């Protein structure tokens with residue numbers, strides 16, 4: 589039930605120059621990804637995997653949005669909860685996919701940059717989906733990050749990222765938690781979302797200088813909650829609450845990452861139908877408990893490299909993402 593897609597990144601400027609041969613081949617039609625596990629493109633062994641969707645190195649950012657995000661967002665607009673994870677070795681594109689980048693030399697505005705990833709596009713489409721239908725709505729965003737099992741808020745400008753938040757169990761609704769001090773910024777208009785990301789980025793830098801390899805070892809959960817009141821052409825004002833969680837996971841490459849380690853154990857228990865699922869063993873799995881075997885619609889975009897020097901990691905990632913397909917939750 590949990591949908592899993594694979595995204596291979598293209599070779600960089602230094603790989604094309606070193607005349608690199610891709611050990612990875614994608615077949616979107618057959619939704620399969622094939623990787624050469626032994627030398628020689630003249631003769632060799634291969635390992636194949638089938639996923640709900642596969643996107644080759646030529647896949648553009650807009651292709652990921654129209655294909656995976658747009659549908660998920662729709663479901664969020666209907667009043668449901670959805671989560672999208674990005675799993676993969678450092679350098680394969682987790683952040684590129686989830687956040688994206690800016691085209692060089694200020695060639696475009698943020699809302700039109702073809703390099704923009706899921707988060708900016710989503711925030712911009714929410715304001716162009718509901719506004720363009722006259723519905724009373726309200727968007728809230730939060731950016732909770734995890735590093736060495738400590739929680740950080742990368743968006744409230746009052747305190748710095750050296751302030752560790754506390755987590756407790758939410759006695760109201762089961763399988764949930766309360767983060768004391770977590771900030772929920774309100775996004776009033778499109779012209780306000782970039783500003784928010786700008787701030788987050790500035791704090792991301794601070795966390796990086798304060799914590800070792802922060803960008804590779806941390807887990808980030810960017811949440812967007814939409815409070816809606818759709819007044820159709822009739823007059824019925826329906827009450828809808830939708831939450832979308834965009835999770836940029838720590839690099840899967842393998843000191844110890846308790847949340848990553850626990851996320852793996854949790855998937856294992858869910859797919860092997862074991863009675864006890866270790867959700868409580870990490871901040872990530874407790875925070876996102878409802879996204880693993882709960883009532884939330886979840887999708888995992890596993891990122892991979894086409895370079896042969898990343899073979900071992902590429903297989904581990906695919907093997908992992910492949911096992912994840914058997915998780916049933918809704």
Ligand SMILES: CCNC(=O)N1N=C(c2cc(F)ccc2F)C[C@@]1(CCCN)c1ccccc1
Nearest residue numbers: 687688689690698701704707708785786788789
């Ligand atoms: C520096 C100014 N900010 C900035 O460019 N951006 N800041 C980003 C960003 C910052 C966060 F805290 C959390 C989630 C995010 F999405 C996304 C990014 C790219 C960020 C780097 N991967 C962007 C915005 C709009 C269009 C294309 C890219």
Ligand SMILES: Nc1ncnc2c1ncn2[C@@H]1O[C@H](COP(=O)(O)OP(=O)(O)O)[C@@H](O)[C@H]1O
Nearest residue numbers: 596597598676677678679680681682683684685
């Ligand atoms: N799909 C892609 N298309 C073009 N470049 C990509 C793609 N994915 C990743 N890259 C590039 O690969 C490098 C790794 O980026 P990044 O997303 O930060 O990795 P990660 O988040 O997995 O650690 C960057 O220079 C980025 O620009």
Ligand SMILES: [Mg+2]
Nearest residue numbers: 682683803804
């Ligand atoms: Mg990264």
